[PDB]
JSON list of C-alpha atoms and ligand atoms in Angstrom, two decimals:
[
{"chain": "A", "resi": 1, "resn": "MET", "atom": "CA", "xyz": [15.37, 6.03, 15.35]},
{"chain": "A", "resi": 2, "resn": "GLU", "atom": "CA", "xyz": [16.55, 3.97, 12.38]},
{"chain": "A", "resi": 3, "resn": "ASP", "atom": "CA", "xyz": [17.99, 5.14, 9.05]},
{"chain": "A", "resi": 4, "resn": "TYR", "atom": "CA", "xyz": [16.76, 2.85, 6.25]},
{"chain": "A", "resi": 5, "resn": "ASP", "atom": "CA", "xyz": [18.75, 2.58, 3.05]},
{"chain": "A", "resi": 6, "resn": "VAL", "atom": "CA", "xyz": [16.07, 1.91, 0.47]},
{"chain": "A", "resi": 7, "resn": "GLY", "atom": "CA", "xyz": [16.73, -1.27, -1.48]},
{"chain": "A", "resi": 8, "resn": "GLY", "atom": "CA", "xyz": [19.51, -2.31, 0.85]},
{"chain": "A", "resi": 9, "resn": "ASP", "atom": "CA", "xyz": [22.47, -3.59, -1.19]},
{"chain": "A", "resi": 10, "resn": "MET", "atom": "CA", "xyz": [20.55, -3.02, -4.45]},
{"chain": "A", "resi": 11, "resn": "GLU", "atom": "CA", "xyz": [20.08, 0.66, -3.43]},
{"chain": "A", "resi": 12, "resn": "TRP", "atom": "CA", "xyz": [17.56, 2.79, -5.44]},
{"chain": "A", "resi": 13, "resn": "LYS", "atom": "CA", "xyz": [17.64, 1.41, -8.98]},
{"chain": "A", "resi": 14, "resn": "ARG", "atom": "CA", "xyz": [15.52, 0.04, -11.77]},
{"chain": "A", "resi": 15, "resn": "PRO", "atom": "CA", "xyz": [14.48, -3.39, -10.45]},
{"chain": "A", "resi": 16, "resn": "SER", "atom": "CA", "xyz": [14.48, -6.63, -12.52]},
{"chain": "A", "resi": 17, "resn": "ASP", "atom": "CA", "xyz": [11.44, -7.83, -10.58]},
{"chain": "A", "resi": 18, "resn": "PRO", "atom": "CA", "xyz": [8.43, -5.43, -10.13]},
{"chain": "A", "resi": 19, "resn": "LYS", "atom": "CA", "xyz": [7.87, -6.50, -6.51]},
{"chain": "A", "resi": 20, "resn": "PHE", "atom": "CA", "xyz": [11.43, -5.76, -5.38]},
{"chain": "A", "resi": 21, "resn": "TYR", "atom": "CA", "xyz": [10.65, -2.69, -3.25]},
{"chain": "A", "resi": 22, "resn": "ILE", "atom": "CA", "xyz": [7.42, -4.22, -1.96]},
{"chain": "A", "resi": 23, "resn": "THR", "atom": "CA", "xyz": [9.60, -7.05, -0.66]},
{"chain": "A", "resi": 24, "resn": "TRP", "atom": "CA", "xyz": [12.22, -4.67, 0.77]},
{"chain": "A", "resi": 25, "resn": "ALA", "atom": "CA", "xyz": [9.56, -2.68, 2.66]},
{"chain": "A", "resi": 26, "resn": "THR", "atom": "CA", "xyz": [7.76, -5.73, 4.11]},
{"chain": "A", "resi": 27, "resn": "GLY", "atom": "CA", "xyz": [8.18, -6.36, 7.83]},
{"chain": "A", "resi": 28, "resn": "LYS", "atom": "CA", "xyz": [10.00, -3.07, 8.47]},
{"chain": "A", "resi": 29, "resn": "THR", "atom": "CA", "xyz": [8.56, -0.59, 10.89]},
{"chain": "A", "resi": 30, "resn": "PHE", "atom": "CA", "xyz": [8.79, 2.96, 9.65]},
{"chain": "A", "resi": 31, "resn": "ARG", "atom": "CA", "xyz": [8.26, 5.31, 12.64]},
{"chain": "A", "resi": 32, "resn": "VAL", "atom": "CA", "xyz": [8.06, 9.02, 13.07]},
{"chain": "A", "resi": 33, "resn": "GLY", "atom": "CA", "xyz": [11.69, 9.99, 13.61]},
{"chain": "A", "resi": 34, "resn": "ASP", "atom": "CA", "xyz": [13.15, 7.49, 11.15]},
{"chain": "A", "resi": 35, "resn": "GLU", "atom": "CA", "xyz": [15.00, 8.42, 7.99]},
{"chain": "A", "resi": 36, "resn": "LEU", "atom": "CA", "xyz": [14.95, 7.05, 4.45]},
{"chain": "A", "resi": 37, "resn": "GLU", "atom": "CA", "xyz": [18.04, 7.28, 2.32]},
{"chain": "A", "resi": 38, "resn": "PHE", "atom": "CA", "xyz": [17.89, 6.76, -1.43]},
{"chain": "A", "resi": 39, "resn": "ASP", "atom": "CA", "xyz": [21.31, 6.11, -2.96]},
{"chain": "A", "resi": 40, "resn": "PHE", "atom": "CA", "xyz": [21.80, 6.40, -6.74]},
{"chain": "A", "resi": 41, "resn": "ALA", "atom": "CA", "xyz": [24.05, 7.82, -9.41]},
{"chain": "A", "resi": 42, "resn": "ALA", "atom": "CA", "xyz": [23.31, 11.45, -10.37]},
{"chain": "A", "resi": 43, "resn": "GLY", "atom": "CA", "xyz": [21.03, 11.74, -13.39]},
{"chain": "A", "resi": 44, "resn": "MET", "atom": "CA", "xyz": [20.28, 8.01, -13.60]},
{"chain": "A", "resi": 45, "resn": "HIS", "atom": "CA", "xyz": [17.41, 8.01, -11.03]},
{"chain": "A", "resi": 46, "resn": "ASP", "atom": "CA", "xyz": [15.63, 10.58, -8.83]},
{"chain": "A", "resi": 47, "resn": "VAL", "atom": "CA", "xyz": [13.01, 10.68, -6.09]},
{"chain": "A", "resi": 48, "resn": "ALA", "atom": "CA", "xyz": [9.52, 12.18, -6.26]},
{"chain": "A", "resi": 49, "resn": "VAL", "atom": "CA", "xyz": [7.26, 12.11, -3.17]},
{"chain": "A", "resi": 50, "resn": "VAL", "atom": "CA", "xyz": [3.75, 11.64, -4.49]},
{"chain": "A", "resi": 51, "resn": "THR", "atom": "CA", "xyz": [0.10, 11.02, -3.71]},
{"chain": "A", "resi": 52, "resn": "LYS", "atom": "CA", "xyz": [-1.40, 7.52, -3.76]},
{"chain": "A", "resi": 53, "resn": "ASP", "atom": "CA", "xyz": [-3.03, 8.07, -7.14]},
{"chain": "A", "resi": 54, "resn": "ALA", "atom": "CA", "xyz": [0.18, 9.45, -8.65]},
{"chain": "A", "resi": 55, "resn": "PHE", "atom": "CA", "xyz": [1.98, 6.38, -7.19]},
{"chain": "A", "resi": 56, "resn": "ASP", "atom": "CA", "xyz": [-0.53, 3.98, -8.62]},
{"chain": "A", "resi": 57, "resn": "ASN", "atom": "CA", "xyz": [-0.28, 5.48, -12.12]},
{"chain": "A", "resi": 58, "resn": "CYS", "atom": "CA", "xyz": [3.30, 6.55, -12.02]},
{"chain": "A", "resi": 59, "resn": "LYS", "atom": "CA", "xyz": [2.33, 10.19, -12.59]},
{"chain": "A", "resi": 60, "resn": "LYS", "atom": "CA", "xyz": [5.62, 12.16, -12.66]},
{"chain": "A", "resi": 61, "resn": "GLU", "atom": "CA", "xyz": [4.22, 15.73, -12.91]},
{"chain": "A", "resi": 62, "resn": "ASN", "atom": "CA", "xyz": [3.54, 18.08, -10.01]},
{"chain": "A", "resi": 63, "resn": "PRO", "atom": "CA", "xyz": [4.79, 15.84, -7.17]},
{"chain": "A", "resi": 64, "resn": "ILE", "atom": "CA", "xyz": [4.69, 16.81, -3.42]},
{"chain": "A", "resi": 65, "resn": "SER", "atom": "CA", "xyz": [8.49, 16.90, -3.53]},
{"chain": "A", "resi": 66, "resn": "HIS", "atom": "CA", "xyz": [11.19, 16.04, -6.07]},
{"chain": "A", "resi": 67, "resn": "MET", "atom": "CA", "xyz": [14.92, 15.47, -5.48]},
{"chain": "A", "resi": 68, "resn": "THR", "atom": "CA", "xyz": [17.56, 15.03, -8.15]},
{"chain": "A", "resi": 69, "resn": "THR", "atom": "CA", "xyz": [20.85, 15.12, -6.20]},
{"chain": "A", "resi": 70, "resn": "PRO", "atom": "CA", "xyz": [21.92, 11.92, -4.38]},
{"chain": "A", "resi": 71, "resn": "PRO", "atom": "CA", "xyz": [21.89, 10.69, -1.77]},
{"chain": "A", "resi": 72, "resn": "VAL", "atom": "CA", "xyz": [18.27, 11.76, -1.01]},
{"chain": "A", "resi": 73, "resn": "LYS", "atom": "CA", "xyz": [17.64, 11.70, 2.76]},
{"chain": "A", "resi": 74, "resn": "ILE", "atom": "CA", "xyz": [14.02, 12.10, 3.94]},
{"chain": "A", "resi": 75, "resn": "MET", "atom": "CA", "xyz": [12.94, 12.25, 7.59]},
{"chain": "A", "resi": 76, "resn": "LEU", "atom": "CA", "xyz": [9.60, 10.65, 8.37]},
{"chain": "A", "resi": 77, "resn": "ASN", "atom": "CA", "xyz": [7.89, 13.19, 10.57]},
{"chain": "A", "resi": 78, "resn": "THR", "atom": "CA", "xyz": [4.23, 12.29, 10.28]},
{"chain": "A", "resi": 79, "resn": "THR", "atom": "CA", "xyz": [2.20, 9.07, 10.52]},
{"chain": "A", "resi": 80, "resn": "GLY", "atom": "CA", "xyz": [0.32, 7.56, 7.60]},
{"chain": "A", "resi": 81, "resn": "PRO", "atom": "CA", "xyz": [1.00, 6.42, 3.98]},
{"chain": "A", "resi": 82, "resn": "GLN", "atom": "CA", "xyz": [3.98, 7.86, 2.10]},
{"chain": "A", "resi": 83, "resn": "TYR", "atom": "CA", "xyz": [4.66, 7.12, -1.58]},
{"chain": "A", "resi": 84, "resn": "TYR", "atom": "CA", "xyz": [7.84, 7.52, -3.59]},
{"chain": "A", "resi": 85, "resn": "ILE", "atom": "CA", "xyz": [8.66, 6.86, -7.27]},
{"chain": "A", "resi": 86, "resn": "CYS", "atom": "CA", "xyz": [11.65, 7.46, -9.48]},
{"chain": "A", "resi": 87, "resn": "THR", "atom": "CA", "xyz": [10.57, 9.59, -12.47]},
{"chain": "A", "resi": 88, "resn": "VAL", "atom": "CA", "xyz": [13.42, 8.63, -14.86]},
{"chain": "A", "resi": 89, "resn": "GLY", "atom": "CA", "xyz": [12.30, 6.73, -18.00]},
{"chain": "A", "resi": 90, "resn": "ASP", "atom": "CA", "xyz": [10.20, 3.59, -17.43]},
{"chain": "A", "resi": 91, "resn": "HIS", "atom": "CA", "xyz": [11.56, 2.94, -13.96]},
{"chain": "A", "resi": 92, "resn": "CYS", "atom": "CA", "xyz": [8.36, 3.58, -12.01]},
{"chain": "A", "resi": 93, "resn": "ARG", "atom": "CA", "xyz": [6.37, 1.59, -14.52]},
{"chain": "A", "resi": 94, "resn": "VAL", "atom": "CA", "xyz": [8.60, -1.43, -13.87]},
{"chain": "A", "resi": 95, "resn": "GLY", "atom": "CA", "xyz": [8.56, -1.17, -10.09]},
{"chain": "A", "resi": 96, "resn": "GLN", "atom": "CA", "xyz": [10.93, 1.58, -8.90]},
{"chain": "A", "resi": 97, "resn": "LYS", "atom": "CA", "xyz": [8.51, 2.93, -6.34]},
{"chain": "A", "resi": 98, "resn": "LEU", "atom": "CA", "xyz": [8.04, 2.52, -2.64]},
{"chain": "A", "resi": 99, "resn": "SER", "atom": "CA", "xyz": [4.96, 2.61, -0.45]},
{"chain": "A", "resi": 100, "resn": "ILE", "atom": "CA", "xyz": [5.15, 2.66, 3.30]},
{"chain": "A", "resi": 101, "resn": "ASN", "atom": "CA", "xyz": [2.94, 3.47, 6.26]},
{"chain": "A", "resi": 102, "resn": "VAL", "atom": "CA", "xyz": [4.48, 5.46, 9.08]},
{"chain": "A", "resi": 103, "resn": "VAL", "atom": "CA", "xyz": [3.39, 4.77, 12.69]},
{"chain": "A", "resi": 104, "resn": "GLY", "atom": "CA", "xyz": [4.01, 6.65, 15.98]},
{"chain": "A", "resi": 105, "resn": "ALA", "atom": "CA", "xyz": [7.47, 6.94, 17.54]},
{"chain": "B", "resi": 1, "resn": "CU", "atom": "CU1", "xyz": [15.17, 5.37, -11.77]}
]
């Protein structure tokens, strides 16, 4: 397995550039068995696991999951698309979201 720290050195924050997490995710292989870790300061950001449509429109309500205490560690147990957004303020709207596609171990 591999434990990915989302955003690397920038961690999970409000990006200056909307494509920042698209860039971070590019080229990486997310496999069943891998872990994602979102590091952030309590109350400044959070993590919501959401559907594709909620990702696309930054819909914060009624997510699949929602975590407010950092660090958020999520195991990738199934293959297919996974979407994450931060629901604090305008962060999602400016790019604080991540889309990945999990493949077999
Ligand atoms: Cu945020």
